[PDB]
Amino acid sequence: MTWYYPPDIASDLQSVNLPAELKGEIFACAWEYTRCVIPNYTNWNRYVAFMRTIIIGVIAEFRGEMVDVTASTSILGYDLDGVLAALFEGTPGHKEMAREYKTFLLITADKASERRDGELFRRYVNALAQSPRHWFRMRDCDALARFTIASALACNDLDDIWYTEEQFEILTEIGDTLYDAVAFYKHRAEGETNSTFAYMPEDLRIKAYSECREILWALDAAWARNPKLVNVINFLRFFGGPIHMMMRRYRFVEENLTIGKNTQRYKALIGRSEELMFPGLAEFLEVGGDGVCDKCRYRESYHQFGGVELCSECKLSWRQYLECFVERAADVFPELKT
Amino acid sequence: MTWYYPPDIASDLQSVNLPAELKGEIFACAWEYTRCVIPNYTNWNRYVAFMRTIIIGVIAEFRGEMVDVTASTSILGYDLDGVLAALFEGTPGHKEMAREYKTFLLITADKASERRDGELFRRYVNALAQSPRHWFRMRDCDALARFTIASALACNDLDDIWYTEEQFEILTEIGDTLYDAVAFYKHRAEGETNSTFAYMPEDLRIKAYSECREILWALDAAWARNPKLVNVINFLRFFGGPIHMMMRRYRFVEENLTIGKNTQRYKALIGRSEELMFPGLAEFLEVGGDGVCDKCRYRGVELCSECKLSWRQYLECFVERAADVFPELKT
Ligand SMILES: CC(C)=CCC/C(C)=C/CC/C(C)=C/CSP(=O)(O)OP(=O)(O)O
Ligand SMILES: CC(C)=CCC/C(C)=C/CC/C(C)=C/CSP(=O)(O)OP(=O)(O)O
Ligand SMILES: [Mg+2]
Ligand SMILES: [Mg+2]
Ligand SMILES: [Zn+2]
Ligand SMILES: [Zn+2]
Secondary structure, eight states: OOOOOOGGGTTOOTTSOSOHHHHHHHHHHHHHHHHHHSOOOSOHHHHHHHHHHHHHHHHHHHOGGGOOTTSOSOBTTBOHHHHHHHHHTTSTTHHHHHHHHHHHHHHHHHHTSGGGGSHHHHHHHHHHTSOHHHHHHHHHHHTTHHHHHHHHHHTTTOTTOOOOHHHHHHHHHHHHHHHHHHSHHHHHHHTOSOOHHHHSOGGGHHHHHHHHHHHHHHHHHHTTTOTTTHHHHHHHHHHTTTHHHHOTTSOTTTTTSOBOOOHHHHHHHHHTHHHHSOTTHHHHHHHHTTOSOSSSBOOSOOOOOOSOBOOHHHHHHHHHHHHTHHHHHHHHOGGGTO | OOOOOOGGGTTOOTTSOSOHHHHHHHHHHHHHHHHHHSOOOSOHHHHHHHHHHHHHHHHHTTOGGGOOGGGOSOBTTBOHHHHHHHHHTTSTTHHHHHHHHHHHHHHHHHHTSGGGGSHHHHHHHHHTTSOHHHHHHHHHHHTTHHHHHHHHHHTTTOTTOOOOHHHHHHHHHHHHHHHHHHHHHHHHTTTOSSOGGGTSOGGGHHHHHHHHHHHHHHHHHHTTTOGGGHHHHHHHHHHTTTHHHHOTTSOTTTTTSOBOOOHHHHHHHHHTHHHHSOTTHHHHHHHHTTOSOSSSBOOOOBOOHHHHHHHHHHHHTHHHHHHHHOGGGTO
């Protein structure tokens, strides 16, 4: 396996002590993922900037101690605010997407370090189980799903396209449900905190893929004749499982071409929430951080999922929320009712 | 489960007696295939023209009797040459792509009808096994591969991009190998005449997918900073397996989100070669028709030990042949 990627990023990470071999695999992952889920572009500078947000994120996912968004320094030799400005300067969601990405670095770096055992990560894992709507919003930011919808419009110079909050919530729910359904087994093997069907009932995993895919086709059909909006649908379609066959990050080939097998720091970051946290996350962490249910089983710190275990009365509410996805979709996207 | 597709094609096939639910299924298939392997467009008119070629093709592929390019009239209520001009007028391969398509209609509708037993089809299936280069050229046309590369350029108003014969051959070999690797099982339980790894040793299936996927990543890299060539790469990448997860035609849900389980007629049509057959097919049929190898078993053809190894060396050779054809891979 040779690692192929544009030379623009081939001398990235000069300040960073990792094997050249590993820099290679990281650069390739950012290229592969960018080309899979933003398969069209008009703006090379934004494309590469997006690639650089994936380079930092890949590193954060497996060596949290190397990435500290709180230090407000160079991150891995990159000036993060300026990379974020190259990407989104003059798009509707610049400031909010800079928050989305910093939240992703903060949480992913904590999860992939000692700091996993700290207050921020405990509050976050607990806050995931607050509610099914809360789950999908945090999972959105963990997967950079609305960040990548914003990035796909930006990289095609669509600086005038945007969505309501509820519209982002439906689009990312479709994307994340589709991915999380295909990535189930892989996520379990890893002991993930962040996988839809650690929380959502396993017996709905096939039905929920099917429903999401179908709605996606329905919105796609409704958006016909506007080729700009194809960049949003393509993100979700290509992210929602297909990347498992396409990216060397995954083991389709290896598996013989088959699919299916310190409370101060918290309070300081909460005070920096306008900088570091997506709109609403600080509230999510204050309300859900300690658990919201007496029967749900929390751990004192964080071939099985590593998160909160929902009690069976909570799981019904999760089941029921999944089961009214079509109505919740048609609701924010009236064009589906037609 | 209901069928979703732009309302532009929702009243196609008014001349065709089929249940509205099968029309719906066919419209969905064409809409879903188009969006999957041509994920961008600028030219909606050309995009609908492409969907309609897929609509006709879906119907040829399961009821050959309902499609006859030979009869020189409208096909399933479409003016075929008109859909093809809507798609390709001003593009560099209009005449060739029209011949390409017509060959697909000719061979697909024979395969899926009584004509399956004719000289023309008998010669075509023997011609598949002439050589591995021949297989990939004919598989190309059976899958509308280069037809779809051309349509991806057209649907994005790239009226001036084209490839040499050699360059299409490699591009479609990438796509057809990736697709045929993944679709192996779907095709074994179908008894396809047209599957790569019925000819290519089955053990190279995994290697080949890997290597094709690796070359497609190398090509993608080389073509960086030229957004218009993404439409070529995107076709091969999304055609080559990922459609099994994305289109309802396939069984990803139903399999629990898993992948991996007369001679007068013949001579009349050769006489209409410039109209009905891709450049060179006539020859492939003339020379290949009665088999090429004393040892190979003809009547899909079953290859001898000598031939099977020659095909092996042709697969193993792929990187060299791609780099030969596309200097951009060497660097
Ligand atoms: C920047 C980012 C979102 C992730 C870094 C690794 C990358 C780029 C993976 C491919 C994109 C996916 C599937 C992200 C889901 S977050 P996940 O942790 O569930 O991804 P995984 O399933 O482990 O690949
Ligand atoms: C336009 C066309 C070429 C085919 C008509 C039906 C469609 C739209 C199928 C999907 C496109 C593919 C993968 C073509 C392979 S032909 P095959 O018969 O070997 O593929 P199969 O696996 O049976 O779909
Ligand atoms: Mg992960
Ligand atoms: Mg078929
Ligand atoms: Zn509970
Ligand atoms: Zn032989």
